[PDB]
Amino acid sequence: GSQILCVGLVVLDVISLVDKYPKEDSEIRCLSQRWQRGGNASNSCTVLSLLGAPCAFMGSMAPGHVADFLVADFRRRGVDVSQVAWQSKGDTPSSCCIINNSNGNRTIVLHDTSLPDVSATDFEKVDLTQFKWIHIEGRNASEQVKMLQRIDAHNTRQPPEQKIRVSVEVEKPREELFQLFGYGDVVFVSKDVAKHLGFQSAEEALRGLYGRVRKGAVLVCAWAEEGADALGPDGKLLHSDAFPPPRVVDTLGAGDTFNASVIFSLSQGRSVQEALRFGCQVAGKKCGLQGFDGIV
Amino acid sequence: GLVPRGSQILCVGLVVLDVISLVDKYPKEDSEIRCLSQRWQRGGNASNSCTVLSLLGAPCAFMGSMAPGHVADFLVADFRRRGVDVSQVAWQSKGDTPSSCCIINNSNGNRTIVLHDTSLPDVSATDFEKVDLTQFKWIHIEGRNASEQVKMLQRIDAHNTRQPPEQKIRVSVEVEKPREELFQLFGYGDVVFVSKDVAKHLGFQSAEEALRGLYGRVRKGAVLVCAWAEEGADALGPDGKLLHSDAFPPPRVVDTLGAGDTFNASVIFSLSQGRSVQEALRFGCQVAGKKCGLQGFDGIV
Ligand SMILES: CCc1cc2nc(C(F)(F)F)c(C#N)c(N3CC[C@](C)(O)C3)c2[nH]1
Ligand SMILES: CCc1cc2nc(C(F)(F)F)c(C#N)c(N3CC[C@](C)(O)C3)c2[nH]1
Ligand SMILES: [Cl-]
């Protein structure tokens, strides 16, 4: 088990870099434009690859010239596309990303093409013996739970030595996804999902939502400039201060850089404290760079 | 391939990739929202004119700046989809192929635009010097880099001087942006298009006021054309006769985006076909009117 699998989205991010965020009905002119391979799992993959970890992407892709750019990006990164669930009905999703240069804030206007999501069926044809770790980006909850149950089942039939570690990301404040809370050894819950539940801090969110996690699972919550916090079976709250760059220029994919760096550090067998710190470290380095090149 | 001699209408100007999103509410900074619909459209004045000329049944070619890439690839395949000849493109070593982001609010209809970057250089007089003019019957220039286009226009004038009247290249100019640098372009071309917005910024309040007020700026024998949306369009020749055509509005107005370009290309086409300035104004108004009740350019003819 040498690879890390990331199940989720691949999107074409059409990035416009603005000197100030536009006012409604205004006609701003951007400083620079760029095309970049997006989607949470696709970003985590980039980050993992840059960190030296052999990784594989699994997500739906619609053949076309857009997919040709995305696939070429994965291949240039060394991201294994073999497990890609190629669809026939639909187009590859795209998004319009306004990056405010003065603060690094990112505004994503997503076009979800209604492409069929990766199903338990697509997941059943996957050889789980090559994977050290598997990360699922919370989208089709009910169907992903079937992929999650399939991993638990494989793990029981395996020695503690060659067991697959699982991580789950709850990013959007969707009720269907709160069932995944749930599964996986490491559960990543976004600051957005936390505020949706009436939690005003990462520690509030952790203490409040730990009940919802599997026995032995680590619940992780990043809180932008406030750093990130973790809560494991011991009940001890772990915290990492952020690593902000002096000039924050691009936060697009920062949360993904966080996730992949926590998964990476924990995959390398480091403490949750060390992994929390490293997550913040790599996410913070990224926030001072455009794209993902230069974080290591 | 082999283009026959004096057969094409050339359009020199912008090509841009417009990514258009329709949203429930305008997105606030640092938010990940889902759009209702997303369109990737080929825009730009000379670009749009080419599309219309192709639909009208004219062999047409586009000359604009593009940088090799995936944005250029989408635009070149859209050009070809609309039968536009793309062999005159000034391919660039530095800069980004223009791409604009438009956010349309559902609840109020207001459009927020993130305009393309300055990075890509315009078509130059040295870029235009390389073109063998003989395959063109008409050359239309969208006013942008005025100093440089003036030399292009001087070049067409030079070419024309040494040709029989039956093989002389007719020329048109579009001054659409209210930029000072452009107003020198009035003195060039056989047909001069002035926009309602340019006319207003110069103090004019009607097509009549604009044509009578600016006809002095044109060269001897030129036609100065001004379309004023719902008020129709006027043309003014060297005879001093102010021509007019009323607008031909559609039953319900769908998309007005690119209708000025549809008008321009239709006036050019009609004049290129040997029709009169009055017959061309009319046709221009008819085609631009039909376009307004249609989404995109699909069935304008
Ligand atoms: C309000 C938007 C925003 C600003 C910002 N700044 C930083 C900085 F500390 F580096 F300056 C980080 C980082 N690391 C960060 N996020 C991105 C998601 C995250 C993993 O929770 C941390 C941020 N998010
Ligand atoms: C204020 C926005 C606007 C509405 C509108 N409606 C029409 C209609 F008459 F068809 F209803 C036309 C036309 N033809 C038109 N313009 C767009 C450029 C043009 C060549 O001057 C004509 C319009 N512009
Ligand atoms: Cl422009």
From Swiss-Prot, chain A:
<dbReference type="GO" id="GO:0032868">
    <property type="term" value="P:response to insulin"/>
</dbReference>
<protein>
    <recommendedName>
        <fullName>Ketohexokinase</fullName>
        <ecNumber>2.7.1.3</ecNumber>
    </recommendedName>
</protein>
<dbReference type="GO" id="GO:0070873">
    <property type="term" value="P:regulation of glycogen metabolic process"/>
</dbReference>
<comment type="subunit">
    <text>Homodimer.</text>
</comment>
<feature type="binding site">
    <location>
        <position position="106"/>
    </location>
    <ligand>
        <name>ATP</name>
    </ligand>
</feature>
<dbReference type="GO" id="GO:0009750">
    <property type="term" value="P:response to fructose"/>
</dbReference>
<feature type="binding site">
    <location>
        <position position="40"/>
    </location>
    <ligand>
        <name>beta-D-fructose</name>
    </ligand>
</feature>
<dbReference type="GO" id="GO:0070062">
    <property type="term" value="C:extracellular exosome"/>
</dbReference>
<keyword id="KW-0119">Carbohydrate metabolism</keyword>
<dbReference type="Pfam" id="PF00294">
    <property type="entry name" value="PfkB"/>
</dbReference>
<feature type="binding site">
    <location>
        <begin position="253"/>
        <end position="256"/>
    </location>
    <ligand>
        <name>ATP</name>
    </ligand>
</feature>
<dbReference type="GO" id="GO:0004454">
    <property type="term" value="F:ketohexokinase activity"/>
</dbReference>
<dbReference type="GO" id="GO:0006000">
    <property type="term" value="P:fructose metabolic process"/>
</dbReference>
<dbReference type="InterPro" id="IPR034093">
    <property type="entry name" value="KHK"/>
</dbReference>
<feature type="binding site">
    <location>
        <position position="43"/>
    </location>
    <ligand>
        <name>beta-D-fructose</name>
    </ligand>
</feature>
<dbReference type="GO" id="GO:0070061">
    <property type="term" value="F:fructose binding"/>
</dbReference>
<dbReference type="GO" id="GO:0005829">
    <property type="term" value="C:cytosol"/>
</dbReference>
<dbReference type="GO" id="GO:0009749">
    <property type="term" value="P:response to glucose"/>
</dbReference>
<dbReference type="GO" id="GO:0042802">
    <property type="term" value="F:identical protein binding"/>
</dbReference>
<keyword id="KW-0225">Disease variant</keyword>
<feature type="binding site">
    <location>
        <position position="39"/>
    </location>
    <ligand>
        <name>beta-D-fructose</name>
    </ligand>
</feature>
<dbReference type="GO" id="GO:0010043">
    <property type="term" value="P:response to zinc ion"/>
</dbReference>
Swiss-Prot record, chain B:
<feature type="binding site">
    <location>
        <position position="261"/>
    </location>
    <ligand>
        <name>beta-D-fructose</name>
    </ligand>
</feature>
<dbReference type="GO" id="GO:0006000">
    <property type="term" value="P:fructose metabolic process"/>
</dbReference>
<feature type="binding site">
    <location>
        <begin position="258"/>
        <end position="261"/>
    </location>
    <ligand>
        <name>ATP</name>
    </ligand>
</feature>
<comment type="subunit">
    <text>Homodimer.</text>
</comment>
<dbReference type="GO" id="GO:0009744">
    <property type="term" value="P:response to sucrose"/>
</dbReference>
<dbReference type="GO" id="GO:0005524">
    <property type="term" value="F:ATP binding"/>
</dbReference>
<keyword id="KW-0067">ATP-binding</keyword>
<dbReference type="GO" id="GO:0004454">
    <property type="term" value="F:ketohexokinase activity"/>
</dbReference>
<keyword id="KW-0547">Nucleotide-binding</keyword>
<dbReference type="InterPro" id="IPR011611">
    <property type="entry name" value="PfkB_dom"/>
</dbReference>
<comment type="pathway">
    <text>Carbohydrate metabolism; fructose metabolism.</text>
</comment>
<dbReference type="GO" id="GO:0070873">
    <property type="term" value="P:regulation of glycogen metabolic process"/>
</dbReference>
<feature type="binding site">
    <location>
        <position position="44"/>
    </location>
    <ligand>
        <name>beta-D-fructose</name>
    </ligand>
</feature>
<feature type="binding site">
    <location>
        <position position="18"/>
    </location>
    <ligand>
        <name>beta-D-fructose</name>
    </ligand>
</feature>
<keyword id="KW-0808">Transferase</keyword>
<feature type="binding site">
    <location>
        <position position="45"/>
    </location>
    <ligand>
        <name>beta-D-fructose</name>
    </ligand>
</feature>
<dbReference type="GO" id="GO:0042802">
    <property type="term" value="F:identical protein binding"/>
</dbReference>
<dbReference type="GO" id="GO:0032868">
    <property type="term" value="P:response to insulin"/>
</dbReference>
<dbReference type="Pfam" id="PF00294">
    <property type="entry name" value="PfkB"/>
</dbReference>
<dbReference type="GO" id="GO:0042803">
    <property type="term" value="F:protein homodimerization activity"/>
</dbReference>
<keyword id="KW-0225">Disease variant</keyword>
<dbReference type="GO" id="GO:0005829">
    <property type="term" value="C:cytosol"/>
</dbReference>
